[PDB]
Design an enzyme around this catalytic site. Structure first.
Site, PDB file in Angstrom:
ATOM      1  N   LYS A   1       3.417   6.453   5.336  1.00 21.77           N
ATOM      2  CA  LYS A   1       2.417   5.540   4.804  1.00 21.77           C
ATOM      3  C   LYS A   1       3.018   4.147   4.870  1.00 21.77           C
ATOM      4  O   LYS A   1       4.162   3.949   4.454  1.00 21.77           O
ATOM      5  CB  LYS A   1       2.018   5.895   3.368  1.00 21.77           C
ATOM      6  CG  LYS A   1       0.958   4.967   2.767  1.00 21.77           C
ATOM      7  CD  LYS A   1      -0.350   5.006   3.554  1.00 21.77           C
ATOM      8  CE  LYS A   1      -1.422   4.133   2.923  1.00 21.77           C
ATOM      9  NZ  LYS A   1      -1.288   2.700   3.296  1.00 21.77           N
TER      10      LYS A   1
ATOM     11  N   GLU B   1      -5.747  -3.166  -5.862  1.00 20.66           N
ATOM     12  CA  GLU B   1      -5.887  -3.678  -4.503  1.00 20.66           C
ATOM     13  C   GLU B   1      -6.921  -4.800  -4.524  1.00 20.66           C
ATOM     14  O   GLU B   1      -7.934  -4.679  -5.206  1.00 20.66           O
ATOM     15  CB  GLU B   1      -6.316  -2.580  -3.525  1.00 20.66           C
ATOM     16  CG  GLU B   1      -5.235  -1.580  -3.162  1.00 20.66           C
ATOM     17  CD  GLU B   1      -4.197  -2.148  -2.208  1.00 20.66           C
ATOM     18  OE1 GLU B   1      -4.144  -3.385  -2.045  1.00 20.66           O
ATOM     19  OE2 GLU B   1      -3.430  -1.360  -1.615  1.00 20.66           O
TER      20      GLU B   1
ATOM     21  N   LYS C   1       0.216   4.052  -2.648  1.00 18.78           N
ATOM     22  CA  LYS C   1      -0.860   5.033  -2.548  1.00 18.78           C
ATOM     23  C   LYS C   1      -0.324   6.452  -2.421  1.00 18.78           C
ATOM     24  O   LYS C   1      -0.987   7.407  -2.836  1.00 18.78           O
ATOM     25  CB  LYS C   1      -1.759   4.682  -1.364  1.00 18.78           C
ATOM     26  CG  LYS C   1      -2.623   3.459  -1.621  1.00 18.78           C
ATOM     27  CD  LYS C   1      -3.079   2.801  -0.339  1.00 18.78           C
ATOM     28  CE  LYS C   1      -4.061   1.679  -0.632  1.00 18.78           C
ATOM     29  NZ  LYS C   1      -4.044   0.615   0.408  1.00 18.78           N
TER      30      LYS C   1
ATOM     31  N   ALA D   1       1.399  -3.642   3.861  1.00 13.56           N
ATOM     32  CA  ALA D   1       1.408  -5.015   4.342  1.00 13.56           C
ATOM     33  C   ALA D   1       0.956  -5.933   3.219  1.00 13.56           C
ATOM     34  O   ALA D   1       0.132  -5.549   2.384  1.00 13.56           O
ATOM     35  CB  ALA D   1       0.500  -5.192   5.560  1.00 13.56           C
TER      36      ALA D   1
ATOM     37  N   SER E   1       0.800  -1.217   0.000  1.00 17.78           N
ATOM     38  CA  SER E   1       0.000   0.000   0.000  1.00 17.78           C
ATOM     39  C   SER E   1       0.836   1.272   0.000  1.00 17.78           C
ATOM     40  O   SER E   1       0.267   2.366  -0.048  1.00 17.78           O
ATOM     41  CB  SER E   1      -0.939  -0.009   1.205  1.00 17.78           C
ATOM     42  OG  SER E   1      -1.921  -1.023   1.052  1.00 17.78           O
TER      43      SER E   1
ATOM     44  N   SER F   1      -5.601   3.793   4.394  1.00 17.94           N
ATOM     45  CA  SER F   1      -5.183   2.748   3.462  1.00 17.94           C
ATOM     46  C   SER F   1      -6.384   2.113   2.767  1.00 17.94           C
ATOM     47  O   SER F   1      -6.356   0.936   2.406  1.00 17.94           O
ATOM     48  CB  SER F   1      -4.344   1.684   4.171  1.00 17.94           C
ATOM     49  OG  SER F   1      -3.744   0.811   3.231  1.00 17.94           O
TER      50      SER F   1
END
Length: 412
Positions: A358, A290, A197, A361, A194, A254
């Site tokens: 940020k 995602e 982002k 995982a 993530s 997130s």
């Protein structure tokens, strides 16, 4: 039983400590003991490694000096070499079969000593020689604790990699200049997770700079769009959300759905990768949406970056000329309000400090964070950390990032 004193052995100790290597060899041909030992139990090899005379260490071991000789405090000549940073002597001592995990009175191995005092190269040698990263000293402390306490981030990065039994990528940039201050596996590819982002937010902020997008614009979606980890987008199913709100959910929470919704406005992963190319990042690449991008298949280059690529790209977005002053400040403010990075760097951040970050995982023990932080409310340094492959629990991984953070922050 101290009556067995030897003026030749006593002279050899002095010549080893005093670095007189020709005199040491003279005392050899006159029959002096390479294993002589004063009252404290110190030998010529001890003193040669203490004072740092490679040649004297060489010849003493050539003539059968006890490499693992232990004095009255449990010190091996390897201890003394590691205490003083003598890389070459550490190397020969191990070359001649020294005990890498020799323990003194207090339980200190040579890795405790080298890790504590920031001896980058010696740690690398001790590690490859099989130093025990779990060795406890008199106070139960392990080598990694001593490294972090003394702010030796690269050494720490290596030590957590040992514990995680996985690659660790680490790099530190000066936030304004861009000078690389620390680096470990900085050029190797790691899953982004993530952390991408933050790049997406840059791509959107660039289109808002161009007037091709408005923070106020509202995007309506449906239950068909929601995916895993969509805490903010699942509450506005009908009323919808704005571009700003969606970008706030992407960074601070997130939110996977908000990130995909915003990806469609720039043409999906392919579109984001084009942005990166056109700004100088021909390494970072987004391929999937995602949450599939978090799959972290070994040797798969999909959805990966490198610590140095991400770090410089992030620095350019936050302090470069890719975004207007307002936009780069908006990215920083979004990141400062991160709410899902608590057990990482924020968990060791001392009061008064600034951090904007940020986290990420993914599968197969993937964990990473990008951040700008610094003392006195202003950030002055960027850090990028990635790891993948470990089969340790997510608690252990989270603790791993935090100890790396402590190591950077300490001795700032």
């Amino acid at each position: 039983h101290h009556h067995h004193g030897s003026d030749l052995g006593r002279k050899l100790l002095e010549a080893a400590r005093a670095g007189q290597d020709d005199e040491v060899r003279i005392l050899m041909a006159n029959g002096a003991d390479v294993n002589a030992a004063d009252n404290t139990g110190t030998t010529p090899l001890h003193l040669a490694a203490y004072s740092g005379h490679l040649e004297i260490v060489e010849v003493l071991l050539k003539h059968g000096a006890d490499v693992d000789a232990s004095d009255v405090f449990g010190y091996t000549p390897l201890h003394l070499a590691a205490y003083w940073g003598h890389l070459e002597i550490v190397e020969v001592l191990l070359k001649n079969g020294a005990d890498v995990n020799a323990m003194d009175s207090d339980g200190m191995t040579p890795l405790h000593l080298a890790a504590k005092w920031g001896y980058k190269e010696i740690v690398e040698v001790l590690l490859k020689a099989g130093a025990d990263v779990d060795a406890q000293d008199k106070f139960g402390k392990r080598p990694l604790w001593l490294a972090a306490d003394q702010g030796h981030a690269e050494i720490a990065a290596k030590l957590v990699a040992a514990r995680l039994k996985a690659r660790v990528g680490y790099i530190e940039l000066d936030l304004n200049s861009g000078k690389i201050l620390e680096s470990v596996r900085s050029e190797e590819r790691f899953p982004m997770m993530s952390t991408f982002k933050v790049l997406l937010a840059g791509a959107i902020l660039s289109r808002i700079d161009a007037g091709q997008e408005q923070l106020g614009r509202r995007i309506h979606y449906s239950q068909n769009d929601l995916v895993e980890y969509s805490p903010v987008t699942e509450k506005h199913l009908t009323d919808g959300m704005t571009v700003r709100e969606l970008a706030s959910a992407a960074i601070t929470m997130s939110d996977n759905t908000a990130a995909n919704l915003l990806l469609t406005t720039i043409g999906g992963p392919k579109g984001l990768t084009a942005f990166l190319h056109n700004m100088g990042d021909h390494v970072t690449r987004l391929d999937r949406w995602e949450p599939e991008l978090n799959e972290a298949i070994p040797n798969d280059e999909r959805d990966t970056t490198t610590p140095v690529a991400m770090a410089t790209t992030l620095r350019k977005l936050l302090t470069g000329e890719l975004l207007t002053p307002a936009s780069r400040q908006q990215l920083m403010d979004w990141m400062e309000a991160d709410k899902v990075a608590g057990p990482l760097l924020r968990s060791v951040l001392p009061a008064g400090w600034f951090i904007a970050d940020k986290s990420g995982a993914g599968e197969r023990g993937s964990r990473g964070i990008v951040a700008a932080l610094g003392p006195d409310g202003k950030p002055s340094r960027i850090v990028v950390i990635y790891t993948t492959g470990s089969q340790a629990t997510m608690d252990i991984l989270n603790e791993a990032i935090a100890m790396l953070g402590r190591a950077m922050i300490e001795k700032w």
